[PDB]
Design a protein around this ligand. Structure first.
Ligand SMILES: CCCCCCCCCCCCCCCCCC(=O)OC[C@H](COP(=O)([O-])OCC(O)COP(=O)([O-])OC[C@@H](COC(=O)CCCCCCCCCCCCCCCCC)OC(=O)CCCCCCCCCCCCCCCCC)OC(=O)CCCCCCCCCCCCCCCCC
Ligand SMILES: COC1=C(OC)C(=O)C(C/C=C(/C)CC/C=C(/C)CC/C=C(/C)CC/C=C(\C)CC/C=C(\C)CC/C=C(\C)CC/C=C(/C)CC/C=C(/C)CC/C=C(/C)CCC=C(C)C)=C(C)C1=O
Ligand SMILES: CCCCCCCCCCCCCCCCC[C@@H](O)O[C@H](CO[C@H](O)CCCCCCCCCCCCCCC)COP(=O)(O)OCC[N+](C)(C)C
Ligand SMILES: CCCCCCCCCCCCCCCCC[C@@H](O)O[C@H](CO[C@H](O)CCCCCCCCCCCCCCC)COP(=O)(O)OCC[N+](C)(C)C
Ligand SMILES: CCCCCCCCCCCCCCCCC[C@@H](O)O[C@H](CO[C@H](O)CCCCCCCCCCCCCCC)COP(=O)(O)OCC[N+](C)(C)C
Ligand SMILES: CCCCCCCC/C=C\CCCCCCCC(=O)OC[C@H](COP(=O)(O)OCCN)OC(=O)CCCCCCC/C=C\CCCCCCCC
Ligand SMILES: CCCCCCCC/C=C\CCCCCCCC(=O)OC[C@H](COP(=O)(O)OCCN)OC(=O)CCCCCCC/C=C\CCCCCCCC
Ligand SMILES: CCCCCCCC/C=C\CCCCCCCC(=O)OC[C@H](COP(=O)(O)OCCN)OC(=O)CCCCCCC/C=C\CCCCCCCC
Ligand SMILES: CCCCCCCC/C=C\CCCCCCCC(=O)O[C@H](COC(=O)CCCCCCC/C=C/CCCCCCCC)COP(=O)(O)OCCN
Ligand SMILES: C=C(C)[C@H]1Cc2c(ccc3c2O[C@@H]2COc4cc(OC)c(OC)cc4[C@@H]2C3=O)O1
Ligand code: SF4
Lengths: 156, 105, 83, 70, 318, 115, 175, 98, 71
């Protein structure tokens, strides 16, 4: 069918643009943020993949939870997640964000940020190296490549 | 009230700008230089009361130059009659009033 | 003689921008009144014929007025080409 | 690399070339190829309108030389 | 056929802005010992296209507490004015030939600030308001000095016509006559375009996003395009003003190439400056413009009024 | 006429870009998403509250100084007059009084922002 | 009647005046005055006054920027008013629009006398000059003659501006 | 008089009316003062251009200058009033009676 | 030369308008054809409503706004 071919090509084009231009929110919680900085530094240079930090949630596509999420902080993380225009993605980075980690049995720690927001990629480590975070980012790009919103819409 | 220090000292603080017939830059004339010159000359030195009655012809011509009210009335009376004459159809305006003229240098 | 020198030294050490601006403004005020070329500029501004030179009616006793543009009478612009 | 910056600068330079060259070519094309006349003052506009009147085709650019003097 | 000219001016400007962004990222990266975009396309040549396609397919957000009419009008005004400032520039022939082209650019640049003002106010958020008020202070700082500098420089031209500037600099660049004015003009253009070290309105480290913090998707993209088109436009204006290329009426493309090269050099200097200096404080910007630039500018204005009369150097035009 | 066409074209292009930006993508607007942004926590007061101007006197002064550029802008044409001595005296007179205005405001602490 | 450009521009001028004369939030009022300034610049351009129109537009852009800055500080009014936010403001705006349209209609097809004199329309193109000469702009020469003829005007204007600086500094001193 | 002159005069009348009918904000009235100045500028420029009075071409510029002095004056007063009340409402200026 | 041709052009347009006025207002009650509006008998420069009054809107627009709109 011609229509199916057209929606497939438009799907690929949109998927390509989104993966290519991923803007994470300038947002860091704890130790893991330091490795995030090392991903932006010369050695790795995330900017060369089209990945640039932007402070505003309105101009951001990706949230990287890089650090422990405490109970006091969870409403603010949820709020800045909700202020991201869609499509939006969340990368959970480090043991603390993934499941609580070293502070899993604390009265003031959220046992995993996926209780608060939906997570796309879980990056293990304490902290994950800058290379491991880069691997997770490229995995998120690969996942975005697989999405077929237009094909799904056409089939409806 | 009016203390005429400009006349007393011959200083000319603001009289250069009172009328449009008074020494413009590059001798550029006003639109009504002749009319205002004639009106000013006619009324010079006879006083305000006399000038209003005796120089009314010059002043009326000057005002007609300034606002052109009679000219617009005459043109409107011309074009209304032309519109009436064409609407019922016995005028047929000439080809040089429609764009078919042979222009001259 | 000695106070003004110390004041100038202090001003140059603390506010050189103000010293430079005051010097430039003072030169701009003073120098035009001491220049020989200031007259020439006026003459140049007088030689530019913005409007038409309306001819005069020859009354018969007008020697210095030319009868033709190329006649030797009248103003000359020879000083301008050599400038 | 530093010479890998050059391709982007070349693309930008090529893009910035287009407006001026396009304006020059369009001016030549619509003005008879003899440059667009400039009218900053009413005397130049009067010359242009006289040219349009005497051109016989309502175009200021068409020029009538000494072949109109019998 | 004039419409074709309008399009031939508009579309290439937008393409140059899109690639200017790629150039800034690459220049800043190499100045920071890294590479910058080099994956999305060869040498990152497709990165601007991906950025544009991403921004125009993302969700535009209208804030709940915002005023919609101004919120939507402001980016339109910004982009349309940025495109309008290009029409009187002679490269070497302008699209629109104006007697007072300099005054036209002055007035439209003055009107361009209201995009930032109305955007910040209509966002109805505190950071946007702080950015808008910083724009107010910035304009107050630079406007008087910029106008007086332009007047002082154009006392050598004889008019406000931009094409006459080509004739004025037929033998020498005007920067050899007025480099003290050129330095202050360059800094004032940095302030006027909201560029680092004078980029107070965005205030990224300080105010997160400044005036457009609440803008997303396409409207934000329009603000970004307007800003970069303004960078290019102001540098082209400076290149025409101070580094005048020689124009052959039978080969205008030589002038076009020379002018474009000079404009690129000045824009790259802008990007070079952004990677070298810390940000000003905005009251410090006001004090710099009012206590240093203003007195020197006044003095140099008097000097440039007196000098042509002193040396019989008054330019031709009425 | 050409400038009017240019302005219409630019405004039309910008408005079309806004319309595409608002009608092409998928919108999922909800109350949390449209709430004002203040770094993750809800704002305390209104953004429509009085925001003090500390440079208020410079702003008033800018009004007068801006009108002086209007007086100095016809200077290029004034240099073409025959009375260059009168013209130059007036041009310098206006710039000296402009500088004196700045000197008075500077010395009387008018250029300092309020604390 | 040709293209109705001048009449359209003057109508937009009046509409902007009605907008800021309604006395809504100053931010909105400032916008209406900016619209009026731009449109008045267009009107003056359509008559040969390029410099005067551009100068007035620039001056009012600067003044309205200062007014915006002052409004955010001293005229804020937590729920600011747009023309449709209040019955008084909307009523004044509608009254202004209706009164302008009524005057235009009464002066357009017929020829009424309102206060001073009458009008038939005819377009403003009728009253032009036909003068054909010049390598200069008459408006520019008239404005430039301020430095040779208007010596007294320059003196009084400069003194007034210096005194204005002194006066504003005296008024806001307080104590 | 053409329609443009009556439109300019109507603009002046609307602004004068706006000035006279006070609402609450003082700044709203200063804006009507500015509008009256703008209407006068346009009117006098149109008259001057039409009659080709070359010398008069400098008077609107002068007219602009004293427009700023009047605006800067008014804003200055608006500061002091606000500093007394935290509001620019004209209702607060009721200490003196007739 | 330009003045000599401009005089003839203006005079020819005025004469053509006069010849058309003689025809249009033949049967208007007391219309005096070619009557001036000024008391004085000296020459008055025409108003451009007197020259282009009976002509098409294209040349009227070009005569009024042609120079101003040319960019
Ligand atoms: C004469 C009559 C003039 C009629 C104007 C048009 C008719 C009025 C309605 C259209 C405008 C408002 C649209 C609207 O409210 O949609 C709400 C609608 C839904 O509202 P909602 O969220 O349910 O309610 C929210 C609240 O109401 C909260 O809403 P809000 O607070 O945002 O509402 C404010 C809005 C509400 O409207 C009103 O209050 C009544 C209308 C008064 C407007 C006139 C005031 C005078 C302004 C000066 C005159 C301008 C020229 C007008 C004449 C032109 C003639 C050709 O008033 C305005 O802001 C209108 C401003 C337009 C001025 C444009 C000036 C551009 C300046 C550029 C710089 C200068 C250049 C040089 C010159 O939202 C949308 O449709 C999406 C955005 C729509 C805005 C798009 C851009 C504006 C439309 C073009 C306007 C004209 C531009 C030229
Ligand atoms: C210190 O970190 C930072 C950087 O360094 C890595 C930055 O670069 C940086 C600047 C932001 C960059 C990420 C650049 C972003 C690129 C733009 C937003 C894309 C804009 C491109 C389009 C919108 C232009 C239009 C696209 C068309 C192809 C043009 C033609 C138009 C048609 C009509 C034809 C910031 C803010 C930053 O903070
Ligand atoms: C007049 C025009 C109007 C519309 C203009 C829109 C812009 C034009 C379209 C531009 C498209 C360019 C983008 C496509 C480039 C694809 C790049 C290519 O390399 O992607 C490959 C795959 O390509 C994509 O699957 C398809 C991309 C293109 C899809 C079809 C595009 C059709 C365009 C039609 C335009 C229609 C416009 C509709 C609106 C009018 C896989 O690469 P990737 O895996 O990432 O690489 C990872 C990094 N590695 C390699 C180093 C590891
Ligand atoms: C680069 C600058 C120039 C660009 C040049 C092209 C200009 C493009 C135009 C700009 C708009 C872009 C929008 C593209 C998507 C279409 C959106 C809308 O127009 O379509 C629907 C319009 O349909 C409406 O439901 C109404 C349909 C019928 C009711 C009134 C229409 C009457 C017309 C009669 C049609 C019958 C056949 C006509 C044959 C000619 C609205 O659906 P809606 O969900 O809200 O909007 C979100 C769109 N999504 C889904 C893609 C995300
Ligand atoms: C009798 C009063 C003396 C004591 C009281 C002082 C109060 C008055 C303030 C100053 C008085 C000066 C005003 C005099 C009128 C100026 C016009 C006249 O004098 O000629 C001008 C002479 O102007 C010269 O530049 C010299 C006078 C300028 C004086 C400098 C300004 C100082 C004023 C300071 C006091 C004002 C208030 C305080 C401000 C600091 C130009 O003439 P010119 O161009 O040949 O020919 C014009 C005719 N054309 C065009 C057809 C060819
Ligand atoms: C394509 C389909 C066409 C539909 C037309 C709809 C137009 C409209 O007003 O709708 C508002 C529309 C959609 O909003 P939603 O309903 O929330 O989402 C729609 C998705 N379902 O919002 C918009 O995008 C508004 C677009 C802006 C209007 C364009 C015209 C604006 C004119 C501006 C003039 C002023 C310019 C200022 C600068 C010029 C000064 C020299
Ligand atoms: C907004 C204000 C725009 C200002 C436009 C100024 C353009 C300009 O300066 O060009 C002048 C140009 C040529 O003059 P000169 O080259 O200087 O000399 C004549 C000899 N050739 O003059 C013109 O063409 C005038 C044409 C009409 C002016 C345009 C008026 C536009 C007004 C915008 C109104 C738009 C709608 C109203 C509201 C807008 C938003 C709601
Ligand atoms: C300025 C530079 C860039 C200018 C912009 C040019 C963009 C051109 C490329 C556009 C690519 C196609 C757009 C696809 C994204 C649109 C939004 C979207 O993806 O929504 C997908 C949505 C999914 O919704 P549902 O399956 O029904 O259920 C979800 C609810 N739970 O499905 C759709 O609506 C897709 C409909 C077809 C989109 C039309 C594409 C046509 C091309 C647009 C060209 C624009 C010209 C103007
Ligand atoms: C003859 C022509 C005069 C006019 C031409 C000049 C044109 C415009 C130039 C002046 C513009 C206005 C100047 C404003 C004056 C400022 C006064 C002032 O406030 O000064 C103090 C500082 O004191 C000074 O005034 C600086 C020194 C005194 C003035 C500068 C020098 C005066 C003249 C010097 C040059 C004279 C000619 C050069 C001689 C060459 C040597 C042979 C300011 O510093 P603060 O803000 O308090 O610093 C706080 C942070 N630490
Ligand atoms: C923007 C670039 C090039 C780097 C710098 C940077 C990031 C990402 C995130 C942040 C950041 O710096 C800021 C400021 O300094 C710290 C210091 C921190 O601890 C050392 C910390 O931990 C949460 C967070 C921060 C900020 C932060 O979140 O990439
Ligand atoms: S996972 Fe480890 S490195 Fe990361 S924030 Fe938690 S404790 Fe620090």
């Amino acid at each position: 069918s011609r229509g199916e071919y057209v929606v497939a090509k438009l799907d690929d084009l949109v998927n390509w643009a989104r993966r290519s231009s991923l803007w994470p929110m300038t947002f860091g919680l704890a130790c893991c943020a330091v490795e995030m900085m090392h991903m932006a530094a010369p050695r790795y240079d995330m900017d060369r993949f089209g990945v640039v930090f932007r402070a505003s949630p309105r101009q951001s596509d990706v949230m990287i939870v890089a650090g422990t999420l405490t109970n006091k902080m969870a409403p603010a993380l949820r709020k800045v997640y909700d202020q991201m225009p869609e499509p939006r993605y969340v990368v959970s980075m480090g043991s603390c964000a993934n499941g609580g980690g070293y502070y899993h049995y604390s009265y003031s720690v959220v046992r995993g940020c996926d209780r608060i927001v939906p997570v796309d990629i879980y990056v293990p480590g304490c902290p994950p190296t800058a290379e491991a975070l880069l691997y997770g980012i490229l995995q998120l790009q690969r996942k975005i490549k697989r999405e077929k919103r237009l094909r799904i819409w056409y089939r409806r | 009230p009016f203390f005429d220090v400009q006349k007393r000292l011959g200083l000319d603080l603001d009289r250069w700008m009172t009328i449009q017939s008074a020494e413009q830059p590059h001798k550029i004339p006003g639109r009504c230089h002749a009319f205002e010159k004639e009106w000013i000359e006619c009324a010079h030195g006879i006083g305000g009361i006399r000038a209003e009655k005796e120089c009314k012809i010059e002043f009326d011509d000057f005002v007609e130059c300034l606002l052109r009210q009679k000219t617009m009335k005459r043109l409107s009376a011309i074009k209304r009659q032309r519109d009436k004459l064409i609407k019922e159809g016995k005028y047929t305006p000439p080809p040089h009033h429609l764009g078919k003229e042979d222009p001259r240098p | 003689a000695g106070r003004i020198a110390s004041f100038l030294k202090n001003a140059w050490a603390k506010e050189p921008v103000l010293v430079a601006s005051f010097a430039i403004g003072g030169l701009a005020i003073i120098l035009p009144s001491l220049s020989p070329y200031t007259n020439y500029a006026i003459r140049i501004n007088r030689a530019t014929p913005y409007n038409y030179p309306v001819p005069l009616r020859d009354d018969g006793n007008m020697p210095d007025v030319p009868s033709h543009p190329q006649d030797p009478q009248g103003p000359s612009l020879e000083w301008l080409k050599n400038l | 690399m530093w010479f890998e910056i050059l391709p982007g600068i070349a693309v930008m330079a090529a893009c910035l070339f287009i407006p001026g060259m396009a304006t020059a070519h369009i001016h030549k094309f619509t003005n008879g190829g003899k440059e667009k006349r400039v009218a900053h003052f009413s005397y130049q506009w009067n010359l242009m309108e006289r040219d349009r009147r005497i051109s016989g085709v309502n175009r200021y650019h068409v020029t009538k030389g000494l072949e109109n003097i019998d | 056929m004039f419409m074709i000219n309008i399009l031939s001016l508009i579309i290439p400007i937008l393409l140059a802005v899109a690639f200017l962004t790629l150039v800034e990222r690459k220049v800043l990266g190499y100045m920071q010992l890294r590479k910058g975009p080099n994956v999305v396309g060869p040498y990152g040549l497709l990165q601007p296209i991906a950025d544009a396609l991403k921004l125009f397919t993302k969700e535009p957000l209208r804030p709940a507490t915002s005023s919609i009419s101004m919120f939507i009008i402001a980016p339109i005004l910004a982009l349309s004015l940025a495109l309008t400032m290009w029409v009187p520039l002679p490269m070497p022939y302008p699209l629109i030939n104006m007697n007072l082209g300099v005054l036209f650019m002055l007035a439209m640049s003055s009107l361009a600030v209201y995009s930032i003002l109305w955007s910040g106010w209509a966002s109805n958020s505190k950071y946007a308001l702080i950015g808008a008020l910083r724009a107010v202070a910035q304009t107050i700082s630079y406007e008087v000095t910029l106008a007086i500098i332009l007047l002082s420089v154009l006392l050598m031209n004889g008019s406000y016509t931009l094409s006459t500037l080509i004739t004025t600099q037929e033998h020498i660049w005007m920067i050899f006559t007025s480099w003290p004015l050129a330095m202050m003009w360059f800094i004032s253009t940095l302030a006027e375009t909201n560029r680092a070290p004078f980029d107070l309105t965005e205030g990224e480290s300080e105010l997160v996003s400044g005036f457009n913090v609440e803008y997303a998707a396409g409207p934000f993209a329009m603000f970004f395009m307007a800003e970069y088109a303004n960078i290019i436009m102001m540098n082209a204006f400076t290149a025409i003003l101070f580094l005048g290329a020689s124009h052959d009426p039978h080969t205008p493309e030589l002038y076009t190439i020379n002018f474009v090269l000079k404009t690129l050099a000045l824009t790259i200097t802008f990007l070079w400056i952004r990677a070298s200096y810390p940000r000003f404080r905005y009251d410090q910007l006001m004090h710099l413009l009012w206590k240093s630039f203003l007195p020197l500018t006044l003095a140099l204005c008097m000097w440039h009024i007196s000098l042509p009369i002193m040396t019989a150097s008054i330019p031709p035009q009425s | 006429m050409n400038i009017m066409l240019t302005l219409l074209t630019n405004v039309t292009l910008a408005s079309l870009l806004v319309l595409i930006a608002f009608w092409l993508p998928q919108l999922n607007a909800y109350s949390e998403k449209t709430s004002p942004y203040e770094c993750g926590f809800d704002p305390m007061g209104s953004a429509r509250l009085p925001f003090s101007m500390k440079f208020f006197l410079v702003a008033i002064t800018f009004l007068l100084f801006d009108l002086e550029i209007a007086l100095l802008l016809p200077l290029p044409w004034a240099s073409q007059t025959n009375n260059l001595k009168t013209m130059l005296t007036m041009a310098l007179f206006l710039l000296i009084l402009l500088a004196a205005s700045l000197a008075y405001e500077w010395t009387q602490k008018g250029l300092e922002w309020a604390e | 009647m040709t293209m109705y450009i001048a009449f359209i521009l003057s109508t937009i001028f009046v509409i902007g005046f009605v907008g800021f004369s309604s006395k809504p939030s100053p931010i909105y009022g400032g916008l209406g005055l900016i619209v009026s300034g731009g449109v008045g610049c267009g009107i003056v351009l359509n008559f040969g006054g390029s410099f005067l129109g551009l100068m007035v537009f620039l001056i009012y852009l600067g003044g309205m920027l200062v007014v915006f800055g002052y409004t955010t500080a001293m005229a804020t009014e937590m729920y600011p008013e747009v023309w449709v936010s209040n019955k008084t403001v909307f009523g004044a705006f509608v009254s202004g629009l209706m009164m302008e349209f009524c005057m235009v209609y009464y002066a357009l097809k017929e020829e009424e006398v309102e206060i001073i004199f009458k009008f038939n329309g005819l377009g403003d193109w009728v009253i032009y000059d036909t003068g054909d000469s010049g390598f200069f702009s008459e408006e520019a020469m008239g404005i430039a003659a301020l430095y040779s003829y208007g010596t007294w005007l320059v003196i009084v204007t400069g003194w007034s501006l210096l005194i204005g600086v002194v006066v504003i500094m005296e008024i806001t001193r307080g104590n | 008089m053409p329609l443009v002159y009556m439109n300019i005069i109507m603009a002046f009348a609307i602004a004068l009316a706006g000035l006279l009918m006070y609402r609450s904000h003082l700044m709203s009235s200063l804006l009507c003062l500015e509008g009256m100045m703008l209407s006068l500028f346009i009117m006098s420029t149109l008259i001057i251009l039409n009659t080709h009075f070359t010398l008069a071409n400098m008077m609107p510029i002068i007219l602009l200058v004293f427009a700023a002095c009047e605006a800067a004056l008014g804003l200055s007063l608006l500061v002091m009033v606000s500093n007394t009340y935290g509001t620019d409402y004209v209702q607060n200026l009721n200490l003196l009676q007739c | 030369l330009f003045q000599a041709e401009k005089d003839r052009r203006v005079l020819q347009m005025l004469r053509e308008n006069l010849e058309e006025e003689a025809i249009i207002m033949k049967d208007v009650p007391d219309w005096k054809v070619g009557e001036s509006v000024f008391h004085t008998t000296r020459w008055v420069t025409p108003m451009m409503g007197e020259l282009y009054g009976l002509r098409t809107n294209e040349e009227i627009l070009s005569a009024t706004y042609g120079f101003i709109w040319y960019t």
